[PDB]
Amino acid sequence: GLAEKALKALILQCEENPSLKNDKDIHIIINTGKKMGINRDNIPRIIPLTKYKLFKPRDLNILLITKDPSALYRETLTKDEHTSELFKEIISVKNLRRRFKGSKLTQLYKDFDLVVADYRVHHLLPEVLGSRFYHGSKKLPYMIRMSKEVKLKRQQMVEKCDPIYVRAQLRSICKNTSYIPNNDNCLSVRVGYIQKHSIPEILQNIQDTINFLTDKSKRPQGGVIKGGIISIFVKTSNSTSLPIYQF
Amino acid sequence: RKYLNKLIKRNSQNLRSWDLEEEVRDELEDIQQSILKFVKDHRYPGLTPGLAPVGLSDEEDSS
Amino acid sequence: IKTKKRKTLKNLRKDSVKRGKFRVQLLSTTQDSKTLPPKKESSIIRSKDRWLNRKALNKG
Amino acid sequence: DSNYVRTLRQIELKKLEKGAKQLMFKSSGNHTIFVDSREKMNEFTPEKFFNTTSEMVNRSENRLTKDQLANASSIMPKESLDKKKLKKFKQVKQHLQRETQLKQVQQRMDAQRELLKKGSKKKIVDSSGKISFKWKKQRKR
Amino acid sequence: KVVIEPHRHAGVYIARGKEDLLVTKNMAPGESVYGEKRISVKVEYRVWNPFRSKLAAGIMGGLDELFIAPGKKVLYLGAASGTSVSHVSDVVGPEGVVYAVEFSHRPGRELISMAKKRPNIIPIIEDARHPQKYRMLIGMVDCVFADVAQPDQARIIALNSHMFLKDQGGVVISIKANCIDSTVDAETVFAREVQKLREERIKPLEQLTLEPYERDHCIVVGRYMRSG
RNA sequence: UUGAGAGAUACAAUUUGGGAAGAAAUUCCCAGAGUGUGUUUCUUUUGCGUUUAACCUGAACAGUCUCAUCGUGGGCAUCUUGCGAUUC
């Protein structure tokens, strides 16, 4: 419909408006009628993009926060040659708290373009990594598994790090976008980029996003928006919310 | 013979519909055999929301 | 084509079909039951045969 | 502690066999009918032999003849009767899973209670890690 | 409340309430003889459950021609303490006298004390391999059902049924493979037993596997022709 | 990697059969079976190499003294967070 026209005027002004010269990410926001009941945690649920990959993982600075011993977490992923040219720097959580503290979290925010941590110590993160990261979802810390094996009740944790399968996760997590569920209706997803691709690529990125978010089946990662979407609004991080899908 | 056979079919549909288990044909047979004889973490409840669905292209594309 | 021919021979020589859950066995004649001794079965004679012809004694 | 656990266990055991008393278990055996001729062997159909309909044949708890073929007092029984019949099976299953849980619970302190009495104890250890206790061969007077 | 339904076999019913049971009309009102439940719906009834009655598993598995009939005489071979002899008294009514035989003394005291209450059953306490030893009592019983567990089941039928049975009569026998062989397949045991009955002028009609109640058991029914 | 036997059967082939409507063919409630390609579990036929295995037992846990059982104290929430069971 007019979604191509709305993206056309947004692309035209963002290289022309002096205020919008710096924001390079494109967001669609979703306001629903009912409020989805799950409050805002800090684990970002990711969604796939079935046709067009967003980013390949060899153009983003990737910081990994691992467990406290961190010997074979560092050793295996650096000397496997599946992930050797992938990770930028690996830090243990106790060493991250001790080394990077104060105003150095700002330069850690600016220099490193994406942050991901294991499921072990991700909940401990926001009191050592700072409130600058939790201003929206630009550098919200993403999710990776480490072992591809589970822990039952009273079973000893067997430590294993398979680099191929955690490389495939970073392939599966940089190729697409993610949503963070919220208490109120307004949630925003970052679909596409200004110069990575163009308007027909963003248009089917919109369609695959609203297909996954409105899926009445596939509950725990997809069944978040219930009923129907009232509207969707395409925007940059500093532009206005241009309207599409009025009803 | 249509008059007598319809009355037999009427009594047959009266019993067979009211003395069966259509949707319970599986559960009442599995429980009768027991009577006669997405990864989930234990301690972190945020395992299944945030994990990336690994596809075959993510295991193959060396790029 | 003779592999299909003795397959058909096994079809008419069979005497037990399983009609659904139910099964039907053919009953043999009374004169064959009384005037003929019963068949030996393979489990009782081959147990004796390969015990006598076991490889622990160098037969043959 | 051992007396209480077996008392709950024998309560669930007695309610199990009382729960098996009024329950119905459908039979599916090898019901086989002998025949005397090959011409009746291959023309056999159970609807022909039992002279009744096909849906009447497959039920084994009763199989009424077409002469005997000549409902909803438990009202809306399409959802009420089958669910409530399933709930009696569910309660017997909850009787059984509580009973075998109480059996494993009782055995774990009964080995502990016999561990305290007398004799020369010796703790053996299985290669899988399952511990036990083997005793000396001393005749207690 | 309970929806009632007569069986294919006459004289035995199925009580289809919220729970389901197999049930028989009482003959002795207000008296259960081993602790069994009942439904009064009027006529007072009595329940069966196949886990101790080997005839009841034959009923519930589906028997084509139950020769036990509501007006026919029944020879109960192997009366194990009246646990099912009282049940076949309820299904044949006061019309034909049902005969029960047994050897042991513990069922014998239970049989006589329960046949005091029930005039349908007459108990015999003599060996079932010697039908001449109680020849003073029976003449052509209308059917015989066997539940013996002594390894001459075919002979103990052929001894009794050759001179105590009506011509073109029905013979029922419970046979289990754990009694007789207990080391081969069950189906070959029952295949041995039907040719055993075929030599005794009995044409075997139906054999049924009693699988959900009595493991390794069976019920054979059939016709008996042209002697006695 | 063989010789057959016995099935759950995944797709198709007109059927076999009870009931209903099919004036003329259909087609439904169904109940199965048979056939080929599957896919198969197990029984024996089969040849070579190997006569040793597996389990239990005798006075066979214990001076680095061990094992119970009740308590106490501290670790592991970046998780053996602990069952009338044994987290160390």
SS3 letters across chain C: CHHHHHHHHHHHHCCEECCCCCEEEECCCHHHHHCCCCCCCHHHHHHHHHHHCCCCCCCC
Three-state SS for A12? Answer: helix
Q: How many CB pairs under 8 A join C and D?
A: 37
CA gap A144, B52 in Å, rounded: 7
> Could you tell me the CA-to-CA distances from B13 to A144, B17, B18, D26, E211 in Å, in that order?
58, 6, 8, 20, 29
Of E53, E119, E60, the residue nearest E92 (C-alpha): E119
Kindly report the three-state secondary structure assignment for every residue of A51-118: CCCCCCCCCCCEEEEECCCCHHHHHHHHCCCCCCCCCCEEEEHHHHHHHCCCCHHHHHHHHCCEEEEE
CA gap A161, A87 in Å, rounded: 15
In sequence order, the β-bridge partners of residue A118 are A144
| The dihedral sign for the CA sequence A170, A171, A175, A181 | negative
Report angle CA E88, E90, E94 to the nearest 5 degrees.
105
Residue with tokens 């409105």: A214
CA gap E48, D21 in Å, rounded: 9
Three-state SS for A4? Answer: helix
Burial (CB < 10 A; 0-12, 13-18, 19+), residue E153, is buried
Residue E50, token pair as written in the block: 């196949």
Residue A213, token pair as written in the block: 């978010």
| D13 part of contact set with chain B, CB < 8 Å | no
Asked if E122 and E88 count as a contact pair (C-beta separation under 8 A), the reply is no
Of A50, A46, A6, the residue nearest A26 (C-alpha): A6
Q: How many CB pairs under 8 A join C and E?
A: 8
Residue with tokens 């511990």: D131
Helices of type H across E165-185: 177-180
Mutate to test the interface with B, among A52, A55, A81, A119 (most CBs of B within 10 A): A119
In sequence order, the β-bridge partners of residue E16 are E3, E20
Helical axes E85-92 vs E54-61, angle rounded to 10°: 50
Q: List the A172 CA – F11 C1' distance (angstroms).
A: 37
Give me the residue from B47, B57, B58 closest to A119, CB to CB: B47
Give me the residue from D27, D36, D64 closest to E212, CB to CB: D27
Alpha-carbon gap: E21 to the closest alpha carbon of chain B (Å): 12
Asked if E173 and E143 count as a contact pair (C-beta separation under 8 A), the reply is no
Asked if E82 and D81 count as a contact pair (C-beta separation under 8 A), the reply is no
SS3 content of chain A, % helix, strand, coil (to 5): 30, 20, 50
Chain E positions in Cβ-Cβ contact with residue D49 (cut-off 8 Å): 64
Chain B positions in Cβ-Cβ contact with residue E5 (cut-off 8 Å): 15, 19
| B55 part of contact set with chain A, CB < 8 Å | yes
Residue E127, token pair as written in the block: 């060996």
Asked if E20 and E5 count as a contact pair (C-beta separation under 8 A), the reply is no
Contact E212 B36 (CB under 8 A): yes
Asked if E16 and E3 count as a contact pair (C-beta separation under 8 A), the reply is yes
The per-residue DSSP string of D89-117 comes to: HHHHHHHHHHHHHHHHHHHHHHHHHHTTS
Q: List the D120 CA – F57 C1' distance (angstroms).
A: 19
> Residue E194: closest CA among chain D residues belongs to which residue?
D34
Long-range Cβ pairs for the range A197-203 (8 Å, 24+) = A197/A52, A199/A4, A199/A7, A199/A8, A199/A11, A200/A4, A201/A52, A202/A7, A202/A26, A203/A3, A203/A4, A203/A7
Asked if E18 and D74 count as a contact pair (C-beta separation under 8 A), the reply is yes
Three-state SS for E44? Answer: strand
Beta strands in E130-211 (DSSP E): 141-146, 165-174, 202-209
CA gap B60, B56 in Å, rounded: 6
At least 3 CB pairs under 8 A between chains C and B: no
How many H-runs (helices) and E-runs (strands) does chain B carry? 3, 0
CA gap D41, D54 in Å, rounded: 19
Burial (CB < 10 A; 0-12, 13-18, 19+), residue E144, is buried
CB atoms within 10 A of CB E108: 16
Residue C26, token pair as written in the block: 């053919």
A218 touches strand F (CB under 7 A): no
Sheet holding A187-193, edge to edge: A187-193, A25-32, A229-236, A242-244
For F7, nearest residue by CA–C1' is: C18
Radius of gyration (Cα) for chain A, nearest Å? 19
Sorted by sequence, the CB contacts under 8 Å of residue B54 that are 6+ apart come out as A165, A168, A169, A171, A172
Kind of pairing, strands D32-35 and E202-209? antiparallel
Chain B positions in Cβ-Cβ contact with residue E16 (cut-off 8 Å): 18-19
1-60 of chain C touching strand F, CB 7 A cut-off: 3-4, 7, 10-11, 14, 17-21, 42, 46, 50, 55-56
CA gap B46, A181 in Å, rounded: 13
Asked if A189 and A214 count as a contact pair (C-beta separation under 8 A), the reply is no
115-154 of chain A touching strand F, CB 7 A cut-off: 120-121, 123-124, 151, 153-154
Residue A203, token pair as written in the block: 């248009």
Asked if E24 and E7 count as a contact pair (C-beta separation under 8 A), the reply is no
> Could you tell me the CA-to-CA distances from D27 to B36, D31, E143 in Å, in that order?
12, 10, 25
Which amino acid appears at position B57 of this protein?
S
Residue with tokens 């005489």: E73
CA gap E142, E88 in Å, rounded: 13
Helical axes E153-164 vs E186-198, angle rounded to 10°: 30
Of D108, A221, E222, C23, the residue nearest B51 (C-alpha): A221
Chains that touch B (3 or more CB pairs under 8 A): A, D, E
> Could you tell me the CA-to-CA distances from D2 to B17, D7, D106 in Å, in that order?
50, 9, 6
Interface subset of C 1-60, CB within 8 angstroms of E: 27, 30, 33-34
Task: Give the DSSP letter of residue A175.
Answer: S
Of E4, E7, E25, the residue nearest E16 (C-alpha): E4
D88 touches strand F (CB under 7 A): no
In sequence order, the β-bridge partners of residue E172 are E145, E221
In angstroms, the first-to-last Cα distance of chain D is 28
In sequence order, the β-bridge partners of residue C33 are none
Residue with tokens 């029930």: E118
Residue E121, token pair as written in the block: 């059953």
Asked if D31 and E61 count as a contact pair (C-beta separation under 8 A), the reply is yes
At least 3 CB pairs under 8 A between chains D and A: no
In sequence order, the β-bridge partners of residue E47 are E23
Alpha-carbon gap: D37 to the closest alpha carbon of chain C (Å): 7
Sorted by sequence, the CB contacts under 8 Å of residue A113 that are 6+ apart come out as A60, A61, A139
Residue B54, token pair as written in the block: 């690994």
CA gap C35, C39 in Å, rounded: 13
Q: List the A206 CA – F66 C1' distance (angstroms).
A: 71
Helical axes D80-114 vs B27-35, angle rounded to 10°: 30
Find the farthest-apart pair of alpha carbons in chain B and give their distance in angstroms, rounded.
Answer: 78
Of D23, B31, B32, the residue nearest E19 (C-alpha): D23
Chain D positions in Cβ-Cβ contact with residue B18 (cut-off 8 Å): 71-72, 77, 81
> Could you tell me the CA-to-CA distances from A234 to A27, A40, A225, B34 in Å, in that order?
6, 22, 18, 56
Give resolution, Å, one decimal.
4.0
Q: List the C20 CA – F55 C1' distance (angstroms).
A: 47
In sequence order, the β-bridge partners of residue E21 are E15
Long-range Cβ pairs for the range D72-81 (8 Å, 24+) = D72/B18, D73/E1, D73/E3, D74/E3, D74/E17, D74/E18, D77/B18, D78/B17, D81/B18, D81/E18
Of B31, B48, B30, B26, the residue nearest B39 (C-alpha): B48
Q: What region does A227 belong to: left with phi over 0, alpha with psi -120 to 50, or beta?
A: left
CA gap A75, C17 in Å, rounded: 67
Asked if E159 and E129 count as a contact pair (C-beta separation under 8 A), the reply is yes
> Residue D86: closest CA among chain B residues belongs to which residue?
B28
The per-residue DSSP string of A137-172 comes to: SSS--EEE-SSS----TTPPPPP---HHHHHHHHHH
Alpha-carbon gap: C13 to the closest alpha carbon of chain D (Å): 11
> Could you tell me the CA-to-CA distances from A125 to A70, A103, A134, E153 in Å, in that order?
16, 17, 11, 80
Kind of pairing, strands A62-66 and A177-179? unpaired
| D71 part of contact set with chain B, CB < 8 Å | yes
| The dihedral sign for the CA sequence E81, E86, E87, E89 | positive
What stretch of H or E contains D80? helix D80-114
101-130 of chain D touching strand F, CB 7 A cut-off: 104-105, 108-109, 112, 115-116, 120-123, 129-130
Bases along strand F below 7 A from a protein CB? 4-8, 16-21, 29-36, 44-45, 50-51, 58, 61-62, 66-69, 77-87
Burial (CB < 10 A; 0-12, 13-18, 19+), residue E63, is buried
CB atoms within 10 A of CB D8: 14
In sequence order, the β-bridge partners of residue C25 are C16, D34
Helical axes E85-92 vs E105-115, angle rounded to 10°: 30
Of D63, E212, D59, the residue nearest B21 (C-alpha): D59
29-58 of chain B touching strand F, CB 7 A cut-off: 42-44
Of E155, E158, E188, the residue nearest E171 (C-alpha): E158
Q: List the B41 CA – F85 C1' distance (angstroms).
A: 23
The CA dihedral of D77, D79, D82, D83, to the nearest 10 degrees, is -130
Residue C59, token pair as written in the block: 């037969």
Residue A7, token pair as written in the block: 């993206």
Asked if A209 and A50 count as a contact pair (C-beta separation under 8 A), the reply is no
Task: Give the DSSP letter of residue A31.
Answer: E
Residue A111, token pair as written in the block: 């220099």
Asked if E206 and C27 count as a contact pair (C-beta separation under 8 A), the reply is no
Burial (CB < 10 A; 0-12, 13-18, 19+), residue A195, is exposed
Sorted by sequence, the CB contacts under 8 Å of residue E41 that are 6+ apart come out as E1, E2, E4
Asked if A221 and A187 count as a contact pair (C-beta separation under 8 A), the reply is no
Helical axes D80-114 vs D2-19, angle rounded to 10°: 150
Mutate to test the interface with C, among D41, D42, D55, D57 (most CBs of C within 10 A): D41
For F68, nearest residue by CA–C1' is: D116
In sequence order, the β-bridge partners of residue A28 are A189, A234
Of A121, D75, D88, the residue nearest B32 (C-alpha): D88
Of D53, D51, D60, D56, the residue nearest E63 (C-alpha): D60
What stretch of H or E contains E164? helix E153-164
What stretch of H or E contains D8? helix D2-19
Sorted by sequence, the CB contacts under 8 Å of residue D69 that are 6+ apart come out as B7, B8, B9, B11, B12, D52, D53, D56
